[PDB]
Amino acid sequence: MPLVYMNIIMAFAIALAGLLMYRSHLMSSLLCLEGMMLSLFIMSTLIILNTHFTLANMMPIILLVFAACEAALGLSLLVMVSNTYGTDYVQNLNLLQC
Amino acid sequence: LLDLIWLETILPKTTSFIQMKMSIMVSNQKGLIKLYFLSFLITIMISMTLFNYHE
Amino acid sequence: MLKIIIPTTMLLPMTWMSKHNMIWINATVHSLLISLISLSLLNQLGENSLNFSLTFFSDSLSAPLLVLTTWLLPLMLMASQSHLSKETTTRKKLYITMLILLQLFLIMTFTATELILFYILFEATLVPTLIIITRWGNQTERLNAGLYFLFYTLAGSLPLLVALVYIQNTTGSLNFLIIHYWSHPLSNSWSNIFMWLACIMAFMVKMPLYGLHLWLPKAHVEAPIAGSMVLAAVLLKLGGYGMMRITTILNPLTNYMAYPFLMLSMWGMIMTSSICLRQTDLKSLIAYSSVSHMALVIVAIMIQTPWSFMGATALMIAHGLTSSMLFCLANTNYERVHSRTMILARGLQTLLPLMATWWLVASLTNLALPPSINLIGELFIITASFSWSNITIILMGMNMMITALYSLYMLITTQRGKYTHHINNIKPSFTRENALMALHILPLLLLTLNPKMILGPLY
Amino acid sequence: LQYGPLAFVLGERTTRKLTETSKVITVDGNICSGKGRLAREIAEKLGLRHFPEAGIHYADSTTGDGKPLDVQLSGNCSLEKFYDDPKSNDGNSYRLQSWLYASRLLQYADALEHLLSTGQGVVLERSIYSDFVFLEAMYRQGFIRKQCVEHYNEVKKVTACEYLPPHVVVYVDVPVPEIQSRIQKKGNPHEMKITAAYLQDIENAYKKTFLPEMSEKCEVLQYSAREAEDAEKVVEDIEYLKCDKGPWPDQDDRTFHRLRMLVQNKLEVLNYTTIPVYLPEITIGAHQSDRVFQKFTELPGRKYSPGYNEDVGDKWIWLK
Amino acid sequence: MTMMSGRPGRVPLQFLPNEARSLPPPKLTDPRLVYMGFLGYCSGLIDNAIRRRPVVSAGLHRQLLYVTSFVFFGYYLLKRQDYMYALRDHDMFAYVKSHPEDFPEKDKKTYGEILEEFHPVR
Amino acid sequence: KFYIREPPHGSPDWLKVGLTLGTSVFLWIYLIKQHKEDVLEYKRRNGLE
Amino acid sequence: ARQWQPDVEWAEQFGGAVMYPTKETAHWKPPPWNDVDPPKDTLV
Amino acid sequence: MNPIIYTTLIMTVMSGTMLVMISSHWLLIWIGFEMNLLAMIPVLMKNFNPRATEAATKYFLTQATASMMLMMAIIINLLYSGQWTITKMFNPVAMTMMTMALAMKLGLSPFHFWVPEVTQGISLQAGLLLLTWQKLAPLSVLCQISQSINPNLMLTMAMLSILIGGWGGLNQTQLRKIMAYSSIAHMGWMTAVLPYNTTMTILNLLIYITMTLAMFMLLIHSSATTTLSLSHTWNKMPVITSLMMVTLLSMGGLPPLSGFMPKWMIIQEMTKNESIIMPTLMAMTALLNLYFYMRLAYSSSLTMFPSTNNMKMKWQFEHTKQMKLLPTMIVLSTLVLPMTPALSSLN
């Protein structure tokens, strides 16, 4: 395949890795989720433009819509976590175990 | 020596002891998503290599 | 087979719609009536089994087992109603319901035409037994006993399920007639060796085979009296019946796959009989005796001769009657003195003479006095084993001696000597207890007159 | 139509019934003060429903026929023998206190249900909020253990957090020597044994914990012994109170819906009273438990659900 | 893993094709229907027991509705099940017929000419 | 006997009872008619009767 | 003579946060009765 | 939460699942998952407290990660074939990614860590929903793409699920975590038979949903969430504990109960495909689930634990709310084995 496609898939892998390996802040993980969506948008757009699937030009917009909903959902939960602990740290949410 | 000790030891007591050890190993997680998510990364890497390279 | 089955089911609502003070009377009367009707399955054609329908059939192997089940139910009701007097009406009805469901599952298991139905009913017997043990058991130890009884049994029976569905995939059927007529030899391969083991180990753990027997002292000692009666008289015989059925698809592999089980059963015969000599608990002694007897049955089934199969059938029936009688005898004294220790109450012959007679007769049939059917079965098995190898007589001979020893030891310890001075609450024997003993004993003695009925299909 | 989500959806609301004299009122005071007469008078003047103080058999008053049941099937505690032998090693004291807290919780649920369903106000004698004065008195007199206090606090922490406190808290103030005077002149041979330290402990708990605490979310009206026979004057004092202080002005229809779903369903109210904390005073063994439950179910109207006991004359059981 | 989903000319959500009407309907005393009615009766009794009503007496209209609903649904369940087994057998026979080179008829021997191995029991 | 509403009182809800019994009866007659139609259509398709 | 039923010491085996308590899970405490933890004094 | 809002959110959860189930386009299936998650997060926090907040946060993080992976698999599949129809995946790498995404959505081992925590953190009603309705969509998607999936990865995750469900359930005293580990093991059973017969997957799912609904409704009726709190129910509602005892034995898979039918059907189907070994392991391992079910039945129905004095007051009150389908669910959870050949109607 083309060099450009490889780079976008690498971006997805890096953002996925970033999401998986947490640090202290939740907001950083939320950002990683957004990054994954951004790379998915770019990849699907490149594939759609290249093959000239005309009707599929609308699916990246739908992708963005749902990405926004997910982002909004993530920020709500962060507001509630911060209100509980005064901090958005992952370590605070250890009340429930396996 | 046989009924009360060794026949007890080999079949039922060994089973109880092993399952008790494995339950303690499996269920004693600290509830930190950092640790759980880190394992998910390990699992994802393993599948796409020792399962995805094999077809 | 429907004529026997529907009335048994009927027993269920008959006891649920009975007045609070008539449950025992009603259940006992109609249980006895069902037993009488069942008595009619003993007429056997000869060349082949009676096939009532596609689903059920009766054999000469099967007929004795069914009559023993149906006869054991009213005896269990007589034995239960004493220690259950303080219980509420609903819980008494629940206990009787457990016993009825157990009888229903047992009758169906013995007569099912195919193995999958046999497996399902043979496994369904676990639930009422477990509930009886763990809910009505007197001691704290009953919970542990229930777990041991369940897990030992399932660890054997699940590989059997896998083996059975595999066998139906390769053969096309699990119907016992088709299984018999289309039998083909089992090659000597690792696959066939593990198929043999998966077909045999469930019935081995039901018997129980020596070394896989640890669940039985727990479960038989911690159970209420009726639970113990049905566990020793009938539930041990599921293993023997299933093995006798299943060993038709296992030839010629059995010729050498039987060696370790024969070694275990003979040496463990000696072992459990010796254990009975140093036992402080009286129920524990009767349980281990059952183990010793079932080891003999395992040997008989493994050597696969007509004389050994006849002896195994006779010994299964005789053991079922004798072991139930011994458990009931021990329970009467336990009811008196509220302890299972054998040296607590001594010299009981001075206080209870007719019960001492029942004790003597039960101890005499336990050591297989001629011409009782206990000795008929034991002698036939011993002869078949002698033909199998002349050196088995040494083990068989040793076992006969140790059995006489512990049987008469139990009799002498509980009935003879002088009475313990302190215990003064030993009341005269009730009519209920004497009638229970007689209803155990009279059938056994009657069976000697017509030995062929309990002999089986080979006869 | 039983009240539930469907009733709240189509129509039914609480705020359209609240009409300025809803005003949950509680009239507290030490032992043998005249708080009961004042409470009845306030209720009759303002037109509110009166609730006599919850006793050992309050729950019996609300179920079956309102007749009380035997003490072994209901309560299993004795107020008389708490006066006779308060230190008895059968745990009668804390058993009584815990049963009385449960009874007051049930009565608070009943009163809130009345108010939220009919709009009419209620008057209570004591509450789950003032119940602890007796607990502290018993504990300071060596009548109950530290563990009983901890268990009490657990049950209270998980039960009392669900309800709205009263609008008005009326405290009838009578000094302890007057209390002892009234006690001796009453005649009850058991109440005679009440020491002065016990009444002093009740009064100290009242005045140092209950009133300062309720004064933060409720408005408090204190009255001495003599100025408490004037029911007209107390009612005038209540009619000119500006209830702008507690959580009641922060209540709209949805919080009222949650509260009204909770105050009916008495089993949900009483849920946390029987938490598996094994104090010897309140733990009952399996055999006694079984015996007493079997005996309860043989009471003439208790074997089945209310409308299904034909022994009590119920009809059309087959068709219900 | 999905054997009958892709079969040709199959309507998406019928539950009962028209071809099913060429099959004999289950009798109304079919023991499987009687068992479904018994299931409905047990549901009625457990209903009475949970609400602390007399178990065999309390709601007879309710118990009748339980039994009737179970029998009603079970009738159609049995129709669909018998129809699906009829489809299986139809397809299997047609496939065996159209592929004779996979299901050959070989001449069978009498036991007098088959040499079987003998294994003595001793 | 009982103190307050006891919503099902001495008489049963005749609306609910009537609706339940009507539902059962309608289901049974629908089932009988369905089975008759099934038998007739099956006999017609295979030429039995 | 009566059947044995569990008592307080038997019942308390099932009262911990976990069966089979180890040295680490010994300091685990069972969750609150209602599922409500006390609020933290994390003063903003 | 306003009742109308709660109804709208439950309807949005169900409509997202139905969108996953009726769609032919991969984008619409992804949208169904997104809509389901969006409406599902508030239902977990309906009763607000820090534990419910933490549970909803862990749930959102897990499910959104799964969603991103699922979308990436769809896009790789499109890259290697201009296809949007959900049939059989064209690319092996896309299929691995898709399988792992759906396993994360289901909570299969080694992605099982979230299920016990989230289940413990929420109420019994939300737990009922999470453990019954939230399984339909990924299982339907897996049933559609079953031919494409690699058996080695699927069966590995299924065997891990059974083992880990048993071991983790052995250590619990909280009833919600017991139910969660039970669910993990059941999911392992459902997915082990998927590459062979999707009808057996559907049958297992139906019976599991029936038994789980019965158990959760019995736990709500006797408002208990710990073992010791459920030990009291005998002294107030003995019928409830007897019914729970029988339902527990059915879950264990013991014959002649219904719970045994799915296990029996799955083992048989596997033997047909020459797979004796996997099933022997699966049954012998389900013995662990049976053990901790039996322990709960010991503490709850077969013996009588000590009680409290305040229970006498509860003796005087009937349950305010009654569950309409609880009686039917118990009967279908226990007494349905004689109707086994009716599974042919599922294919």
Ligand SMILES: CCCCCCCCCCCCCCCCCC(=O)OC[C@H](COP(=O)([O-])OCC(O)COP(=O)([O-])OC[C@@H](COC(=O)CCCCCCCCCCCCCCCCC)OC(=O)CCCCCCCCCCCCCCCCC)OC(=O)CCCCCCCCCCCCCCCCC
């Ligand atoms: C395979 C062969 C055939 C098998 C058949 C299938 C199996 C049986 C059917 C299963 C379902 C049917 C019954 C379900 C509802 C029962 C619920 C209940 O509470 O019952 C109480 C109720 C009695 O209560 P009550 O009269 O109101 O007064 C009692 C007091 O109030 C005091 O009452 P209480 O409520 O205060 O007492 C509480 C008590 C309440 O405890 C119970 O009642 C247990 C009920 C659990 C239901 C089981 C789940 C569903 C069935 C699955 C069965 C599985 C079978 C496979 C193996 C597993 C073994 C369980 O709990 C306890 O005391 C704690 C004891 C704990 C011990 C552990 C045992 C628990 C599990 C045992 C299950 C055994 C199987 C069921 C046995 C029959 C039960 C009635 O039962 C009945 O009176 C009715 C029973 C049936 C009568 C109808 C007969 C039909 C009409 C007669 C005519 C005959 C027709 C033929 C015509 C012929 C031509 C003329």
Ligand SMILES: CCCCCCCCCCCCCCCCC[C@@H](O)O[C@H](CO[C@H](O)CCCCCCCCCCCCCCC)COP(=O)(O)OCC[N+](C)(C)C
């Ligand atoms: C406490 C009570 C428990 C219950 C008792 C269970 C008894 C199970 C024992 C099974 C009986 C024998 C099993 C198989 C028969 C022969 C075994 C083997 O040793 O024989 C030789 C096999 O050779 C070697 O021994 C290979 C097997 C050695 C590996 C097995 C490990 C044994 C160690 C003991 C472990 C204990 C097992 C029980 C666990 C509790 C025969 O030589 P060969 O002709 O070539 O093989 C015959 C098979 N062919 C025809 C397919 C080729």
Ligand SMILES: CCCCCCCCCCCCCCCCC[C@@H](O)O[C@H](CO[C@H](O)CCCCCCCCCCCCCCC)COP(=O)(O)OCC[N+](C)(C)C
């Ligand atoms: C524990 C027992 C399980 C209980 C299960 C719930 C039973 C009640 C549910 C209500 C019954 C109505 C459901 C169907 C009514 C009409 C809808 C019909 O058109 O659906 C058809 C399908 O019919 C249904 O699937 C049959 C439902 C019958 C379920 C019961 C079988 C249970 C197995 C054995 C247990 C015995 C149960 C006893 C009954 C109480 C559509 O066919 P199709 O769109 O092409 O297939 C979709 C799936 N595919 C493509 C993947 C194959």
Ligand SMILES: CCCCCCCC/C=C\CCCCCCCC(=O)O[C@H](COC(=O)CCCCCCC/C=C/CCCCCCCC)COP(=O)(O)OCCN
């Ligand atoms: C309470 C304690 C009881 C313990 C009983 C345990 C022993 C039970 C007997 C063995 C159990 C597993 C047997 C498998 C079931 C039979 C199925 C079968 O026969 O299929 C075989 C398959 O055979 C196997 O795969 C079995 C391998 C063993 C896997 C599981 C090992 C478990 C432990 C084995 C030893 C223990 C057995 C004896 C222990 C007794 C109890 C002490 C051949 O089929 P194919 O694969 O098609 O081969 C030919 C075509 N190529």
Ligand SMILES: Nc1ncnc2c1ncn2[C@@H]1O[C@H](COP(=O)(O)OP(=O)(O)O)[C@@H](O)[C@H]1O
């Ligand atoms: N929570 C409680 N704890 C202990 N005793 C109580 C409690 N509540 C009421 N009592 C008892 O009720 C008795 C009389 O009640 P009280 O209201 O003080 O007088 P009155 O009869 O005029 O209403 C008192 O002797 C008091 O001990």
